[PDB]
Amino acid sequence: VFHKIRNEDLIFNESLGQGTFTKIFKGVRREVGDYGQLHETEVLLKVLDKAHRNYSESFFEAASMMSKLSHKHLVLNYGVCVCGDENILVQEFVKFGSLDTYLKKNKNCINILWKLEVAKQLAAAMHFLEENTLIHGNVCAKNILLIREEDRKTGNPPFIKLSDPGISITVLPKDILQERIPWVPPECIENPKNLNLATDKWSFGTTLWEICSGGDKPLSALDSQRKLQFYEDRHQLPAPKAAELANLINNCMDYEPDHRPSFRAIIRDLNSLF
Ligand SMILES: Cc1ccsc1CN(C)Cc1nc(N)nc(Nc2ccccc2)n1
């Protein structure tokens, strides 16, 4: 179970946006750290919409299972606030935020080597999840967090973490699942209970497409009916202009879930480039 954090020890500051049935805020947590030192720690606060309080179990169950698996590429969740009528996840505040926003802002300065490093780190996280037979279920660029930027001055590569799963697509409304095409795989549109480890290989492909596309969203021009038909006609995403990962993207976005490659094989493929 998550550590319970008192409402009295949390300060809510600015809204940073929204997710699926969630509102996101920056805040501060007062805590006692190592050696009894008092800290005021910047935190990211995810608030489940009170109207959708029925999704709270799913909201926190996935985050909890993943937080039981500590890993350098998985986000740190400090705990939860049962802040009265609010269900709140208290998460580390990552300095540079979501990768899709970062990709759009810095597209002119991100090259293939940067993209390759990030892809390898994401694949490393996903391999760890695969070995632990833990399904994430919402891999996407918005859920990749940039801990530190590349610094060619000191040779340091960028460093990323994968964020929490969110509400499970096994419980989300059908219309939300359709809007999440092409991250949600065809078999889960067919039946959300088909959620499987193979799901994350497909979404990883879509995320690689995002990483290579300057933060564009694939198929954003298609409404939900046209996204459904895209899967019905078994289309694949267009190659990114920077097409170095196009083959890997299409190999991961395989309409046959059993044919999607293991993350170990994906990592071997990534290492074989450049
Ligand atoms: C912020 C947000 C908006 C919709 S969803 C979501 C949460 N998450 C996907 C992104 C994130 N997570 C964490 N842990 N930290 C940050 N930092 C940050 C935020 C904003 C600006 C600069 C840096 N951003």
Numbering used by the authors: 536 to 809
What does the paper say about this structure?
JAK2, like other JAK family members, comprises a catalytically active C-terminal tyrosine kinase domain (JH1), a regulatory pseudokinase domain (JH2), and a Src homology-2 (SH2)-like domain that, together with the N-terminal FERM (N-terminal 4.1, ezrin, radixin, moesin) domain, forms the major receptor interaction moiety. The JH2 domain has a key role in mediating both negative and positive regulation of JAK kinase activity and numerous disease mutations locate in JH2, including the prevalent hyperactivating JAK2 V617F in MPN. Previous studies have demonstrated that JAK2 JH2 binds ATP and possesses regulatory autophosphorylation activity on Ser523 and Tyr570. To gain insights on the compound binding modes to JAK2 JH2 and to analyze whether any differences could be observed between binding to WT and V617F, we determined the crystal structures of selected small molecules with JAK2 JH2 WT and V617F.
Our diaminotriazine hits share the aminoanilinyltriazine core structure and were confirmed to have JH2-selectivity over JH1. Diaminotriazine compounds 23–33 were found to bind JAK2 JH2 domain generally with selectivity over JH1, except for analog 33, which bound JH1 domain more effectively than JH2. In general, the binding of diaminotriazine analogs was stronger to JH2 domain of JAK1 compared to JH2 domain of JAK2. Data in the present study and that by Jorgensen group indicate that aminoanilinyltriazine compounds might possess slightly (2- to 3-fold) stronger binding to V617F than wild-type. All compounds anchor to the hinge region and extend towards the Gln626 gatekeeper and towards the G-loop. Overall, the binding modes are highly similar between WT and V617F structures and no major differences can be seen that would explain the differences in the observed IC50 values.
